[PDB]
Every structure is written in C-alpha cells, then in structure tokens.
Amino acid sequence: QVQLVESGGGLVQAGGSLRLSCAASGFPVMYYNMHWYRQAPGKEREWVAAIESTGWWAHYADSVKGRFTISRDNAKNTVYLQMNSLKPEDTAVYYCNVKDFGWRWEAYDYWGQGTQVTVSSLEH
Amino acid sequence: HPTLGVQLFSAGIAACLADVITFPLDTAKVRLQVQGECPTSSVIRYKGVLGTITAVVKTEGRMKLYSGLPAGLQRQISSASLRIGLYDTVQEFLTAGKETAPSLGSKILAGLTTGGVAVFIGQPTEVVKVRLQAQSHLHGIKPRYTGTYNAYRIIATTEGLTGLWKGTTPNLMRSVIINCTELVTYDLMKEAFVKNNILADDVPCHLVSALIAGFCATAMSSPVDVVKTRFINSPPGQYKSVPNCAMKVFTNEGPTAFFKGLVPSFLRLGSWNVIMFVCFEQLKRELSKS
Ligand SMILES: O=[N+]([O-])c1ccc(O)c([N+](=O)[O-])c1
C-alpha cells in the first residue's frame, strides 16, 4: 500500500527558497526512481525532476534546472525538492511520484496528495 | 588430423575475424541494454539493429561501432586458445575415464568447465569492452576512457585489479545458461526432427536446430546478460550487488527490459558462430595441407 506524503510547501516571495519533502511508505524506496511533478490550474501536470533509486543520477526539466535540486535519504524514506530563486510561474501543487513498473505492461503511477507552493510578486 | 598448434592458431584467427566482423552487433546490443538505465536529454534513441547501428554511426562516427575492439580481440585470443586446450584435456578425459559415448551430460560438464575458466581469464577484457561500447558523449554520462589500454590502466589504478573482474559471476551465470540451453535445445530439436523425420538429417536439420537453439539460449540468458552489462558498465557504488541491479531494472523498467538487445544478441551469436566455424575449418585444413 504505497503512500506518498508531500510537505514543506507554502507561500513565498519571488526569488525565495522552499524545501519540499516526500515521505514514502509501503514500498522499498531503495529500488525505485522518484519523481517530482507539478500542476497549476489551467495547465497540465508537468514533470519537474527525477532521481535514481540511490541518487546516482538526477535529471530536471529545463525550466527548473539550476534552481531546483532533487535529493534522497532512503534511510528516512524521504525525497527532497530544494527550490531556489522561486518565480510566480512556480506556483503549483507539487506532487511526489513513484512509477512502479514490476510485473506490468507499463508503469503504474502512484501520487502524493501534493503540496501547494505559491510564489508572490509583491513589492516592498 | 591437425596438430595442437594449428588448432590454437586457427581458432584464434577465426574467432578474431568473426569478432571484428560482428562487433557492431555487440555494440548495438550493449547500447540497447544500457538504454533506459539513465534518462537522456538527447533525441537519439536506439531501436533495432539497423536503427541502433545507423544512429551510432551518424551521431558518433563509424569508429564508435568498434569501441573496445582491442579488448574483444584479446578475449577472443584467450577464449579460443583456452577452449581448444581445455576441450582436449577435459573431453578426452571424460570419454576415457569410463569408456563411454560423448553424451549430453559430458558436453555440459566440459562446456561449463572450459567456459568458467575462460570467463575468469577474460573478464578484464570484457569489462573494458562493455564500458567502452556503452560510453557516449551524447547522453550526459561522461566517458571515463579514451580507449582499451587507457581503460585498463585507469580501472586498475582507481579500482584495483579486482575492479577488472567486476561482473564475473553474472558473466559466469550467463555462460552456463548459454552453454546448457544451446546443447539441450539443439539435441532435443534435432531428435524431435528425427523422431518424426520432418526434415533431412543433412546440414539443413543441423542449421535449423542450431538456429532455434541459439535463439533459445539468447532468450534464456538475456535477463542475465542485460543485468551483467548494466552492472559491469556501472561505476563503483551505483549498485550494491548484482541482484540489486536486477531488482532496480525490474522495478523501474519491468520484465521486457530484461530482453533489451535481444535481436542484436541473437544475430551476433549466430553470425559469430557461423563465421568462426567456416573460418576455423578452412584455416585448419589450410595449415594442415599448405
Ligand atoms: O565463444 N566465444 O568465445 C565467443 C566470442 C564472441 C562471440 O560473439 C560469441 N558468440 O556470440 O557466440 C562467442
């Protein structure tokens, strides 16, 4: 019974930082590549980042590379998305994702509930 | 009846010639097997034999098909000479110990003995060759080596001599599977052909049965072959063990990923065996009667 729980989202000014966490439960996270997606209303769900089973490789969407980093601690069953220089265009619900392929024709997608990240553009 | 030296030299030359002829098939197989292990931001995607070969040729050059060819040739020398020597000293021993016929079981026993010694002797060549075949400048993984001997020197200095024998047990398991599956499938299919008399017991039955047995061996050893290629190609620390690599392949890519490069593998096997058989017989006869 796979359960992915995202946390760490919030409301931040543009150019700010935010660290999202994914607590993974009910599966051996050490064998699974993990993914971060995001969906904003009026847009499709966008793949953000992917990390290897043990963190050997990490790939990003071109819109987030250099700003976002993906990380793991398989000991805590946690996946991290560090988001820097946040822009209002980064406002979305961010989703942790596990594609369990196994004994299937194609991979089955498991999703978290998502954590909302809002980037404000207010002047001071 | 050729002497031992003629056999050794003819086996070496024929195996090396078949190796250089069919090496692009092996490179295509390695490319198809390591594809999917790490996501790539390039549009270049390998599919098929001609597709993979042409993609490699047009994106990296014709010389990239023969990446690790000196390592392949060194193996071929070691494996061919060792095969001849141990074939003699083991199969003659098996036939003379109890004075019986060359059964199937004796062929498995001799084949595994010779193949195990050959795999252990030629593992460094196979590590270097797989790593050179798999490395590319297009998919975001930095090539580690410039060539075969550079790869030897770097692996020995930065990973130890033990690092040159990485993947010995998957290679050994694959050799056992290929040998046993070829022998069993070939004998069963031939005596199925003959127990009915479906086809003439001249060469064509032997060709059909060897074709089917070679495909069966390739399919049976394909999961081990994919896991072996990915584990050997992997830098230290990426995979805790070989079953760890297999489990990651299964969970992130599924069962069909255990048959990547199956068509190049089967074509490589069949064409290499045909070329080496014809060349080996011709060289034996020529050096026996030059
Ligand atoms: O037995 N061998 O030494 C050997 C070498 C290269 C090969 O490509 C093959 N093969 O495909 O069957 C076999």
Classified as helix, coil or strand, A59 is strand
Distance of CA A75 to the CA centre of its chain: 18
A29-A30-A34 Cα angle (round to 5): 55
What DSSP character marks residue B167?
Answer: T
CA distance B191 to B209: 10
Cβ–Cβ under 8 Å, residues B119 and B168: yes
B6-B11-B13 Cα angle (round to 5): 95
What beta strand segments (E) does chain B contain? none
Q: Which domain holds residue B88?
A: 4-288
CA distance B249 to B27: 20
Q: For an interface test with A, which of B37, B248, B249 has the most A Cβ atoms less than 10 Å from its Cβ?
A: B248
Cβ–Cβ under 8 Å, residues B257 and B226: yes
Helix (H) or strand (E) holding A22: strand A18-25
Find out whether the beta carbon of B73 lies less than 6 Å from any atom of ligand 1: no
Q: Which residues of A touch B140 (CB under 8 A)?
A: 59
CA distance B256 to A89: 39
CA distance B270 to A30: 39
CA distance A118 to A63: 17
Q: Which residue reads 């003959």 in tokens?
A: B194
Closest Cβ–Cβ partner in A31, A59, A107 for B39:
A59
Closest Cβ–Cβ partner in A50, A101, A105 for B251:
A101
Find out whether the beta carbon of B269 lies less than 6 Å from any atom of ligand 1: yes
- B99 backbone dihedrals φ, ψ, rounded to 5°: 60, 65
Q: How many CB atoms lie within 10 A of CB A2?
A: 15
Q: Which residue reads 């594609």 in tokens?
A: A99
Classified as helix, coil or strand, B86 is helix
CATH number at residue A61: 2.60.40.10
Q: Which of B229, B86, B272, B112 is nearest to B180 (CA)?
A: B112
Q: Do B252 and A33 touch (CB under 8 A)?
A: yes
Residue B58 marked as a ligand binder: no
Q: Which residues of A touch B248 (CB under 8 A)?
A: 31, 53
CA distance A28 to A3: 12
Cβ–Cβ under 8 Å, residues B112 and B176: yes
Number of domains in chain B: 1
Q: Which domain holds residue A80?
A: 3-120
Q: Which residue reads 């060359």 in tokens?
A: B102
Residue B107 marked as a ligand binder: no
- B46-53 CB contacts, 8 Å cutoff, 24+ apart: B48/B263, B49/B25, B49/B263, B49/B264, B49/B267, B52/B28, B52/B264, B53/B24, B53/B27, B53/B28
A13 forms beta bridges with: A120
Q: Do B238 and A54 touch (CB under 8 A)?
A: yes
Cβ–Cβ under 8 Å, residues B163 and B236: yes
CA of A78 to the centre of ligand 1 (A): 45
Number of domains in chain A: 1
Technique that determined the structure: cryo-EM
